[PDB]
Design a protein around this motif. Structure first.
Motif, PDB file in Angstrom:
ATOM      1  N   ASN A   1      -9.044  -2.743  -7.000  1.00  0.00           N
ATOM      2  CA  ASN A   1      -8.832  -3.988  -6.266  1.00  0.00           C
ATOM      3  C   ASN A   1      -8.733  -5.185  -7.208  1.00  0.00           C
ATOM      4  OD1 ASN A   1      -8.948  -2.455  -3.944  1.00  0.00           O
ATOM      5  ND2 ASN A   1     -11.072  -2.998  -3.463  1.00  0.00           N
TER       6      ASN A   1
ATOM      7  N   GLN B   1      -3.685   1.571  -0.271  1.00  0.00           N
ATOM      8  CA  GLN B   1      -2.866   1.535   0.935  1.00  0.00           C
ATOM      9  C   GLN B   1      -3.692   1.752   2.199  1.00  0.00           C
ATOM     10  OE1 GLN B   1       1.131   3.351   0.998  1.00  0.00           O
ATOM     11  NE2 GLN B   1       0.812   3.897  -1.156  1.00  0.00           N
ATOM     12  N   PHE B   2      -4.770   2.535   2.103  1.00  0.00           N
ATOM     13  CA  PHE B   2      -5.513   2.915   3.300  1.00  0.00           C
ATOM     14  C   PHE B   2      -6.351   1.771   3.855  1.00  0.00           C
ATOM     15  CE2 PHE B   2      -5.719   7.273   1.030  1.00  0.00           C
ATOM     16  CZ  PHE B   2      -4.374   7.467   1.269  1.00  0.00           C
TER      17      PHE B   2
ATOM     18  N   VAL C   1      -9.570   1.216   3.204  1.00  0.00           N
ATOM     19  CA  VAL C   1     -10.984   1.561   3.318  1.00  0.00           C
ATOM     20  C   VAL C   1     -11.657   1.785   1.975  1.00  0.00           C
ATOM     21  CG1 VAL C   1     -10.812   2.466   5.658  1.00  0.00           C
ATOM     22  CG2 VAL C   1     -10.326   3.958   3.708  1.00  0.00           C
ATOM     23  N   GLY C   2     -10.948   1.645   0.853  1.00  0.00           N
ATOM     24  CA  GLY C   2     -11.559   1.906  -0.440  1.00  0.00           C
ATOM     25  C   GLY C   2     -12.695   0.960  -0.771  1.00  0.00           C
ATOM     26  N   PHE C   3     -12.610  -0.285  -0.294  1.00  0.00           N
ATOM     27  CA  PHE C   3     -13.623  -1.278  -0.639  1.00  0.00           C
ATOM     28  C   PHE C   3     -15.000  -0.864  -0.137  1.00  0.00           C
ATOM     29  CE2 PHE C   3     -16.110  -4.721   1.303  1.00  0.00           C
ATOM     30  CZ  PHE C   3     -16.607  -5.302   0.153  1.00  0.00           C
ATOM     31  N   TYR C   4     -15.069  -0.321   1.080  1.00  0.00           N
ATOM     32  CA  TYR C   4     -16.348   0.045   1.674  1.00  0.00           C
ATOM     33  C   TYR C   4     -17.054   1.159   0.913  1.00  0.00           C
ATOM     34  CZ  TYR C   4     -13.943  -2.436   5.425  1.00  0.00           C
ATOM     35  OH  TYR C   4     -13.238  -3.362   6.158  1.00  0.00           O
TER      36      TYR C   4
ATOM     37  N   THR D   1      -2.977  -5.557   0.800  1.00  0.00           N
ATOM     38  CA  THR D   1      -2.012  -5.178  -0.227  1.00  0.00           C
ATOM     39  C   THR D   1      -0.752  -4.577   0.386  1.00  0.00           C
ATOM     40  OG1 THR D   1      -2.521  -2.860  -0.697  1.00  0.00           O
ATOM     41  CG2 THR D   1      -4.123  -4.515  -1.400  1.00  0.00           C
TER      42      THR D   1
ATOM     43  N   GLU E   1     -12.575   2.135  -7.141  1.00  0.00           N
ATOM     44  CA  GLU E   1     -11.926   1.301  -6.134  1.00  0.00           C
ATOM     45  C   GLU E   1     -12.088  -0.182  -6.449  1.00  0.00           C
ATOM     46  OE1 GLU E   1      -9.995   1.675  -3.250  1.00  0.00           O
ATOM     47  OE2 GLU E   1      -9.617   3.614  -4.208  1.00  0.00           O
TER      48      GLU E   1
END
Ligand SMILES: Nc1ncnc2c1ncn2[C@@H]1O[C@H](COP(=O)(O)OP(=O)(O)OP(=O)(O)O)[C@@H](O)[C@H]1O
Ligand SMILES: Nc1ncnc2c1ncn2[C@@H]1O[C@H](COP(=O)(O)OP(=O)(O)OP(=O)(O)O)[C@@H](O)[C@H]1O
Ligand SMILES: [Mg+2]
Ligand SMILES: [Mg+2]
Lengths: 83, 638, 184, 638
Positions: free
Chosen positions: B37, B119-120, B122-125, B101, B33
């Motif tokens: 990013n 798209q969601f 929440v990937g960063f967390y 994004t 992720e």
């Protein structure tokens, strides 16, 4: 994130939906023949407003979901056991 | 009635725990992720430069850098992307389920020719899976550099930055958890990058601490060496196939499969519509030594969406008999789950599965026109083509044309069934085939005597799998597959031949009864042979029973069920040559005396020879051996 | 290492009309049960079979039974075809209860071991009576150790009224209650 | 520096979209969550009544009732559980990631018997997978009756309910989307409940279409269908083993497996410690006819966590040689993912795999003490034991003791290896075994002549899998597994025997050399036999090479290339009998004349015969048959 488009898919040759006392190949062929029959009667009935709704609600299938984007196939010419 | 309306609410603290512990099964996905990013930011900064090159005045180099440091346990990623303003960083990092994004794409015009991953929102967390404290350094051109920090405690701190001017992009700093220190070992970072981010759109650098002496020995030692070869293999499937040379295909195959030899062929194709994807396939030159080994992985076809890796061995995309195929597939529209590991509709896989099998069959069809290379293909992968016959009942017809065999008229060359039917006479209606262990055995058998002398070509089956394939392969091109080792072998004969055969039966009628009562149970019927010319007698099999080579194969399998072997066991029939001299002598002797012990011994020994000549194993080799030992005593005079 | 095996089998028709294998009473009941189950799943997926007969059903390895086995893995044979299918009156007389009648002829083979209407050497004469309702499977030829529940079940299946023939879940319900009473 | 602190936020609409489309792959789970929540409410009121019996004055019967309505397309769920207050209603249905159940056990003190499953506070929203609008009737004991309604549009409506008095419980009415009438099918509902909520500890009544046979004087019977329970099969594994009888186990096994016979044996147990789970195991009385069919479900143990179904087959539970085992496993401590369809930590599974394999081995050990039941077990599952020998490296020791075999003095009854260890001769050092196709063929072999005459017991090997065992089963209880079909067969010999052996070698050395010249490459060497009495000569194999049966087994496999494995094929050695009259007379003839055509014909015939008695195939049966046919012409004077 609407995923409603892909949730209607029908695939005949699926092993997950098989019965241990039925010949798997025969069941797959039966499903395929049923698919062929339903799309062939549907077009004959097509050739009307209620008719328009059921086509949009059909499970998508392998034949109708997508089409080929052509690319190249090649054969590699190299001497086996070269000099 | 009075109705009260309220809006839905969310608990932040429980949501953090959910996204941390119940979203991602595998811990290593945290790196994917972050790279995603960083690529997002690089694509953003690149795209605006297409309209205004002055944006890149802060920096012109598009790259990603990974700088692990074991001393402080900090895993730092630096990229030169768009960067953040204060409003951007708060709106994106502080709001769960919000992705800048997606808003950016929705702001862009239709047909931007740029597709992005996240798209969601929440990937960063996912970084919190392995990191307990996150510090983010970013700087947008239209803003100042700020500091972002949180410990996943439901609150985050934002402050201005007065440190080193990063210029443009973002610097993500993760303080690794103590027991997650294995991710500081450079090897796993290389493996993870190659597994998941092999095909990102920008070069990824890796700075490693290899040498400890700084500018010491005779030469100048440098503490850090910049490693670039992490995503060097550029995704040639993205480019048009017409502009790709064969050397490029070979290099890609060698990089992907670590093979030192080149591919045998490349199949490239894409699919458009609601389900859009690109595919690139390779055929290895050598069959792997462990191709059909059970304990190993089923398939080697890797799945990608928007150039990110999803699943390595997906059992749903190809059948077993095509497991040797090497290649990758990339899509852009697959509905992923919350972890981007499965699909929210598993039947999509079975739709991709259907087309790829057809493409592989087309490729294998495209190999047959060149006999020389197709000969090597057949040598390496004869089994895979045959194994697909028994299971893939859908593609049995097409796969049949890809078969080559030695025949009674092909010599040492392997010949197709099409050549076989093309060389057949007008009167023949059946494909005569013989199963056995070797070409010479089936060639020298007593059954093919009359078959060969009448000019009818016979296919030689030598592999054990041949019996399985002919079971389903009942007829090819409308021609029935008839084994001459069975009873009822029909040969086109004239009136004179039929009359002579009938005279043979009427002459040898009582003699056949003499054999039948002599042998008792071992033979169901004794009949005058219409397939032998020289050998006195032979053992033929029933019309629908197991063939001679078949039961040996069945009797040798380790895990088959023995409760059924009684039913399909074929019944033995003893065919006798009418014109043999020995059979005529035995007929005369039996007519002279029905109770001759010598005649009984000759009949038993002759039947024992017949079983051996027909390939049947003796019920007791010891008694036959004792009989032959007794006989040679008489021949010598012992 | 070890290798695999695959799908090979033999039909009820060959076994009983040619090999004449002496199936035990519980074995015949088990074939009845598995055939009924495979029919129910076929009907559960609103699928219709049209050529039920011992030729189209095979005993696989381990005495597995596989419907649709055209080979190891209606061409005459009207002795299984139901009378309403025979007259050809309806455009598609094939139905679930026609399959019930055909499977009832299958139970007739199971419990008698001989083709129905054996006393007749003319097929068209068989056509004429069984179509018109003159001929019924001779239920007296069932084995002497035949339990009463299966006997009544096969009677119901060979009943000429297609609507009276009970639907396949009722068949399986009838078999299981008798099947649990088998050790008597 | 100015540091600003902000609390994390979330976007409600995107979170709703993620929950709907991203967390659940299959739509049928919405029933599972509803049944789980209804059971949660029922257990809540049950525990409350355990302290205050007056709590049930509003309703005494505890159950879940399902009222599908195909006419209105409304799937009505009514359970008599705990109702909602208005505050509870809003706090539980309007708040994402808030679980009132979680708060409930967090409120409860330690020690209470609780099987609660609802933790994530999001299972209720899964109703929107199939329902566009959710209608809820609620009535708590301490509150009035209220209406809650929403269409997942980010807002909900709350009002007092004045319809039919519910008394206590909850009435959920789902307006199913037009494309999902499948969940109104009675068969579909039964399938889903038996698959997922089969073992819920409360009666589930499903009410469906009228039961009317139409002939007022006409028959009407019931104008609806009253079905009272689908979860009739209680979870007997939750009960203690001591209080369950054999009939209970048989009924439970017949319910799960649809079997008509009973179990062969049952093993019920739980595992305590750092992880808690229960396991109930059944062994069928008959082998499954598709035990080694590989296209279908490999492992047949179903997994449960807190008595709700999780997954049906995981390859990390049981190996392939245990595919016949039937049973279910229930646990309480496994942390599931958000979808509850996959276990996030696979390390635990291997411990469970180890424990279940160990306990299954214990159960099989128990069976052996009762011969007749164990004889049925061995007959039905002999192959799987030997596959366990082949693959299970660790348990090969105990798995070997479970093998029973026919021996030379065992008659018809099979004997264990330990029974062979019961019967050594004091000098005997090796467990002699002979391989073959049938018991009779190995009972009277020429190799076992001297072995039998010296009183040494031998084991008959008849199944193809046996040669894989002897590859792995090299020694048993410290005793080697020596075949008499191989060279170097060392049998206890006295001084007279070795003296005679040396005399025979000296006498027959020239004959040995001449047969070595005649047979050339076909035999690696010719030696005088120390194992033959009646047979003049036989073929033995190499010390480390394949046996004839072993080589046949390898070359009969359809998926292996014999060319690669051919290096190991044993060399053939001709062991000649010194005392045989035939051998002595041939020696005299060879000494009298070395180039005698009769001598060469006799020796080639004798070698061809010895190949057959040794289990080897002839390199060409046709030439041997022609040799017989020519010879017996001499006997007939032809
Ligand atoms: N390096 C970056 N460059 C640009 N934006 C970033 C970067 N890191 C984080 N963000 C912003 O913060 C939000 C980050 O999170 P996440 O990675 O959580 O979302 P996504 O990547 O947009 O979506 P998904 O969760 O589906 O991957 C992103 O959506 C993006 O708007
Ligand atoms: N029929 C019901 N009876 C009692 N409580 C209910 C009912 N339906 C919903 N709830 C309450 O609503 C709160 C939310 O639950 P949901 O059903 O939303 O998730 P859960 O059951 O809490 O957990 P999970 O999401 O892990 O399944 C639950 O915790 C439960 O207390
Ligand atoms: Mg993301
Ligand atoms: Mg829930």
């Amino acid at each position: 994130v609407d995923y409603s488009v892909w949730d209607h898919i029908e695939v005949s040759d699926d092993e997950d939906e098989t019965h241990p006392n039925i010949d798997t190949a025969s069941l797959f062929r039966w499903r395929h023949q049923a698919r062929v029959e339903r799309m062939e009667q549907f077009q004959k009935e097509k050739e009307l407003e209620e008719m328009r709704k059921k086509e949009k609600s059909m499970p998508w299938n392998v034949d109708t979901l997508s089409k080929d984007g052509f690319s190249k196939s090649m054969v590699n010419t190299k001497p086996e056991k070269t000099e | 009635g009075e109705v009260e309306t309220f809006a839905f609410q969310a608990e932040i603290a429980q949501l953090m725990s959910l996204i941390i512990n119940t979203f991602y099964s595998n811990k290593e996905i945290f790196l994917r992720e972050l790279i995603s990013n960083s690529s997002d930011a690089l694509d953003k900064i690149r795209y605006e430069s297409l309209t205004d090159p002055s944006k890149l005045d802060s920096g012109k180099e598009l790259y990603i850098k990974i700088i692990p440091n074991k001393s402080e346990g900090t895993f730092t990623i630096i990229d030169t992307g768009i960067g953040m303003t204060k409003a951007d960083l708060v709106n994106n990092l502080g709001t769960i389920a919000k992705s800048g994004t997606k808003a950016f794409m929705e702001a862009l015009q239709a047909g931007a020719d740029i597709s992005m991953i996240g798209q969601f929102g929440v990937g960063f967390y996912s970084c919190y899976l392995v990191a307990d404290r996150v510090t983010v350094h970013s700087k947008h051109n239209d803003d100042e550099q700020y500091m972002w920090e949180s410990s996943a405690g439901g609150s985050f701190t934002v402050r201005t930055d007065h440190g080193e001017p990063l210029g443009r992009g973002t610097k993500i700093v993760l303080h690794i958890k103590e027991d997650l220190a294995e991710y500081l070992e450079v090897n796993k970072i290389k493996e993870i990058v190659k597994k998941h981010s092999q095909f990102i759109g920008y070069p990824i650098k890796l700075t490693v601490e290899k040498e400890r002496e700084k500018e010491k020995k005779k030469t100048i030692k440098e503490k850090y060496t910049e490693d670039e070869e992490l995503n060097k293999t550029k995704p040639i499937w993205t480019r048009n196939a017409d502009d790709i040379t064969q050397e490029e295909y070979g290099d890609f195959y060698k990089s992907l499969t670590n093979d030192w030899e080149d591919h045998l062929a490349v199949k490239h194709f894409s699919v458009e519509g609601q389900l859009e994807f690109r595919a690139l396939l390779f055929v290895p030159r050598r069959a792997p030594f462990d191709l059909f080994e059970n304990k190993k992985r089923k398939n080697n076809i890797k799945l990608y969406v928007r150039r990110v890796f999803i699943m390595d061995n997906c059992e749903d995309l190809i059948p077993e008999y095509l497991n040797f195929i090497k290649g990758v597939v990339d899509s852009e529209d697959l509905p992923l789950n919350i972890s981007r590991e499965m699909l929210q509709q598993n039947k999509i896989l079975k739709v991709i599965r259907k087309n790829l099998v057809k493409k592989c069959l087309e490729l294998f069809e495209e190999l047959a026109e060149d006999k020389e290379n197709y000969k090597k293909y057949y040598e390496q992968f004869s089994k895979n083509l045959k194994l697909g016959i028994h299971e893939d009942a859908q593609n049995r017809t097409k796969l049949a044309d890809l078969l080559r065999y030695h025949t009674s008229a092909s010599g040492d060359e392997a010949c197709s069934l099409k050549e076989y039917v093309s060389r057949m006479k007008e009167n023949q209606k059946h494909i005569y085939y013989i199963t056995g262990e070797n070409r010479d055995q089936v060639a020298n058998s007593s059954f093919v005597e009359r078959v060969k002398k009448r000019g009818y070509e016979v296919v030689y089956m030598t592999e054990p799998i041949d019996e399985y394939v002919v079971q389903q392969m009942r007829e090819y091109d409308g021609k029935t597959l008839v084994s001459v080792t069975k009873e009822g072998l029909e040969l086109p004969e004239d009136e004179e031949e039929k009359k002579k055969r009938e005279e043979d039966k009427v002459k040898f009628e009582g003699l056949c009864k003499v054999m039948k009562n002599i042998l008792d149970n071992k033979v169901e019927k004794v009949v005058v042979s219409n397939r032998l010319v020289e050998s006195p007698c032979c053992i033929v099999t029933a019309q629908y029973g197991w063939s001679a080579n078949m039961e040996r194969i069945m009797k040798a399998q380790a895990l088959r069920d023995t409760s059924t072997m009684g039913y399909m066991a074929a019944k033995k029939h003893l065919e006798i040559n009418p014109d043999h001299s020995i059979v005529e002598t035995l007929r005369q002797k039996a007519e002279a005396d029905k109770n001759d012990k010598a005649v009984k011994d000759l009949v038993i020994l002759l039947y024992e020879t017949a079983l051996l000549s027909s390939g049947f194993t003796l019920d007791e080799p010891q008694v036959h051996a004792s009989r032959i030992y007794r006989m040679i005593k008489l021949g010598l005079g012992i | 290492a070890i290798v695999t095996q695959w799908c090979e089998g033999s039909s009820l028709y060959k076994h009983l009309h040619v090999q004449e294998t002496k199936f035990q009473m519980f074995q015949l009941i088990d074939i009845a049960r598995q055939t009924a189950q495979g029919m129910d799943y076929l009907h559960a997926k609103n699928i219709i079979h049209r050529d039920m007969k011992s030729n189209n059903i095979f005993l696989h390895e381990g005495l597995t039974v596989k419907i649709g086995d055209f080979g190891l893995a209606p061409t005459g044979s009207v002795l299984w075809m139901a009378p309403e299918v025979i007259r050809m009156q309806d455009n598609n007389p094939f139905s679930f209860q026609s399959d019930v009648y055909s499977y009832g002829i299958v139970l007739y083979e199971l419990m008698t071991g001989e083709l129905p209407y054996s006393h007749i050497n003319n097929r068209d004469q068989i056509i004429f009576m069984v179509g018109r309702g003159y001929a019924s499977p001779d239920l007296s030829k069932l084995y002497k150790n035949c339990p009463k529940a299966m006997k009544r079940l096969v009677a119901d299946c060979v009943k000429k009224v297609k609507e009276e023939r009970p639907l396949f879940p009722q068949i399986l319900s009838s078999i299981e209650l008798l099947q649990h009473s088998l050790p008597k």
